[PDB]
Design an enzyme around this catalytic site. Sequence first.
Site, PDB file in Angstrom:
ATOM      1  N   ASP A  40      -4.260  -5.408  15.207  1.00 34.23           N
ATOM      2  CA  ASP A  40      -3.863  -4.019  14.985  1.00 34.23           C
ATOM      3  C   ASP A  40      -3.160  -3.509  16.220  1.00 34.23           C
ATOM      4  OD1 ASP A  40      -3.937  -1.061  14.495  1.00 34.23           O
ATOM      5  OD2 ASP A  40      -5.239  -1.689  12.796  1.00 34.23           O
ATOM      6  N   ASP A  62       0.974  -6.659  17.426  1.00 31.48           N
ATOM      7  CA  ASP A  62       1.852  -6.261  16.362  1.00 31.48           C
ATOM      8  C   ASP A  62       2.127  -7.474  15.483  1.00 31.48           C
ATOM      9  OD1 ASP A  62       4.238  -5.184  14.857  1.00 31.48           O
ATOM     10  OD2 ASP A  62       4.082  -3.536  16.398  1.00 31.48           O
ATOM     11  N   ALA A  85       0.494  -1.756   7.926  1.00 34.75           N
ATOM     12  CA  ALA A  85       1.569  -1.113   7.222  1.00 34.75           C
ATOM     13  C   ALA A  85       2.103   0.060   7.966  1.00 34.75           C
ATOM     14  CB  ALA A  85       1.076  -0.628   5.860  1.00 34.75           C
ATOM     15  N   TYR A 153       8.910   3.589   1.736  1.00 33.67           N
ATOM     16  CA  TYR A 153       7.521   3.061   1.671  1.00 33.67           C
ATOM     17  C   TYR A 153       7.208   2.464   0.296  1.00 33.67           C
ATOM     18  CZ  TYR A 153       2.350   3.185   1.476  1.00 33.67           C
ATOM     19  OH  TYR A 153       1.015   2.819   1.442  1.00 33.67           O
ATOM     20  N   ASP A 282       8.555  13.720  -3.566  1.00 28.38           N
ATOM     21  CA  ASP A 282       7.326  13.626  -4.350  1.00 28.38           C
ATOM     22  C   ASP A 282       7.593  14.060  -5.787  1.00 28.38           C
ATOM     23  OD1 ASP A 282       4.635  13.494  -5.262  1.00 28.38           O
ATOM     24  OD2 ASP A 282       4.069  15.351  -4.216  1.00 28.38           O
TER      25      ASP A 282
END
Lengths: 330, 330
Positions: A40, A62, A85, A153, A282
């Site tokens: 992480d 990474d 992510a 994303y 959205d």
Amino acid sequence: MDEFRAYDGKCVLVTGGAGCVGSNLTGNLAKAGANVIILDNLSSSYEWNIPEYENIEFVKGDILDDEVLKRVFKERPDYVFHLAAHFANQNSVDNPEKDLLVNGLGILKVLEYAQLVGVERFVYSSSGCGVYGLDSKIPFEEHDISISLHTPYQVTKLLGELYTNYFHNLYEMPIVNARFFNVFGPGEVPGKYRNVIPNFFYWAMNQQPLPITGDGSETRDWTFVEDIVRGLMAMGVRREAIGEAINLGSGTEHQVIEMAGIINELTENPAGVVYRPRRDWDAKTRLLSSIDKARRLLDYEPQVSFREGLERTHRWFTENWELIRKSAEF
Amino acid sequence: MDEFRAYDGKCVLVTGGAGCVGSNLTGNLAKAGANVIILDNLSSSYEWNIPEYENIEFVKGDILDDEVLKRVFKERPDYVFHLAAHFANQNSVDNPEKDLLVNGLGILKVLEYAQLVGVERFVYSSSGCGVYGLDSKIPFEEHDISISLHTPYQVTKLLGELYTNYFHNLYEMPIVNARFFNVFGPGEVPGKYRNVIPNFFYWAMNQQPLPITGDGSETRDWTFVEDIVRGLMAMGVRREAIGEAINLGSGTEHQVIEMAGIINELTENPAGVVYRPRRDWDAKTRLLSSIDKARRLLDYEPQVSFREGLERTHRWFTENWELIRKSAEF
Ligand SMILES: O=c1ccn([C@@H]2O[C@H](COP(=O)(O)OP(=O)(O)O)[C@@H](O)[C@H]2O)c(=O)[nH]1
Ligand SMILES: O=c1ccn([C@@H]2O[C@H](COP(=O)(O)OP(=O)(O)O)[C@@H](O)[C@H]2O)c(=O)[nH]1
Ligand SMILES: Nc1ncnc2c1ncn2[C@@H]1O[C@H](COP(=O)(O)O)[C@@H](O)[C@H]1O
Ligand SMILES: Nc1ncnc2c1ncn2[C@@H]1O[C@H](COP(=O)(O)O)[C@@H](O)[C@H]1O
Ligand SMILES: [Cl-]
Ligand SMILES: [Cl-]
Ligand SMILES: [Cl-]
Ligand SMILES: [Cl-]
């Protein structure tokens, strides 16, 4: 319980293992006797979030860095849970190249190393936002996907499935694509690019009005992190999950205004709610998954109610409040 | 004919404009009066392949390089045809990261610049191999897609559609996704990673046996380059193509053994044919597109028969034989 003892003595790599899902997952793997390695970069999480067990090795690095990938993969993991992510919708709209490098090239590198050593399972945290489009029928079934998406994303979450399926198809990698539905619980620190529940807790606990981006009647399928984790752990060991995409959700809907109300109630917030425009990317007034495939293949069943989940989340906030205030990413 | 005069006086950027499709396309745009800019790194093509017109500007460079992208986009193209790609199946299996950078990050950069200046159309060369899976019904219809793919090229060809649809959905970019079916014709130099027809011409014209990877009964929908180009040019100007994926194919099947036979006949090759195993990523015993959407939306109709196309291809080979021998990429 007897199921998860296939992790005992196994080496398990969790990329993104310091985040909300990862921290809960590593804890459970550690209890089951796995030798857990977390990779992480701490870009959205903190080392304090990692539960303290002797059999968790924390490696700061990474997934884009071939040096650190060799460092963890030379341990020869039997299982990889790929949770690293670039999160999430707005962050990706703002930084689409960065998003592609992390979610596209990052998973590809992790897959390539996984191929080199051989794994028993490669479980990828995909997303229910990243694959069900405006024409997909609610409740969302796994076959009913779209390629018409609204953020980078969403694009790169689907890209990760494209890659796991590839590695499954050509190289017989035993992959599983877990499509998470709006995860919440202890272990998500609040911040500008973070999810609504931790931000609402954070704002409510500072007596600020909760900003609703919409009219409040929009719904999500919020899934408590401990439910997600039981899903993931089943996915690692059940033969029937191999090569499959499987929704992990609660299978129920809640309105944003309900969620805001509960959080204001729990936190004794006096400032109520304010209304702001819908975020331009959205397009989802509703998200609701069908979890019948997970029941079928994994004997998955949510155990934690929306309300219980919010209460647990609140407890996490109160118990780590000062650390959360130092850590918040605004 | 009267249709394509909307290109007259317009600035048109063709990335990958020195390749087979691009060279044929730029020539036709130049005849229609467009001020054409080619951006091509010459990785699989040569400058000699570009047709000589006053109104074609050739810029050697890479779609990954932000400097050269600013150089061409400051000309403010009205149309972008994005044909630059890392080609193809085996090349992508061998070099999957490189493949992702070019086909994923490359298109994303080109799209981002296109957004900055505004375009009338963004036409992307997608692929019929990159989206129709083993469960898609022949003849392939545009809705009938798979996310279970067999090479990183297939993955990244679909990724480009994910990105064009995104830019269409959030930013109202007028995109078109052209799913090419096995293009052939003048302008594809042969080589290790190249398509079968130019390699078969090259081997046959050196009196070598044609290597068939399979039993010879596998089929493709081979589409002559000039047909593809008429498709592309319609896509640039027809309102009805906006936001759509549209197959550009011949809509007919031919067996590999037939194709080998014709090429041996045309080239007076005496060495015949040899049989080799199916390539491990090649799960397609048949490809056949449905071109009814292109008829409907673009009045598209193939004009060049398989046989006529092979004869034209042969003429290109004989007329540039020594240059092709110097240029071949084996
Ligand atoms: O500050 C915020 C952030 C989110 N939302 C709403 O809460 C829901 C979930 O938003 P989040 O960003 O957590 O997840 P996503 O939209 O990506 O599912 C959506 O319906 C939003 O409109 C909100 O009202 N205020
Ligand atoms: O050296 C070769 C290359 C290809 N093929 C066959 O020709 C067809 C088209 O192959 P190509 O690589 O041109 O395109 P793709 O397989 O990517 O459609 C396939 O059925 C192959 O099995 C062949 O027989 N010999
Ligand atoms: N490029 C990366 N390499 C390694 N870890 C990452 C990378 N990007 C994000 N992460 C971590 O992955 C986890 C993702 O969790 P989330 O932020 O909930 O999506 C977090 O703990 C991040 O710090
Ligand atoms: N990264 C890149 N930047 C610019 N041009 C490229 C790039 N990669 C490939 N090309 C060109 O794009 C064209 C693609 O045609 P093809 O090789 O038929 O796929 C060729 O002329 C290549 O030289
Ligand atoms: Cl759709
Ligand atoms: Cl089992
Ligand atoms: Cl499929
Ligand atoms: Cl029109």
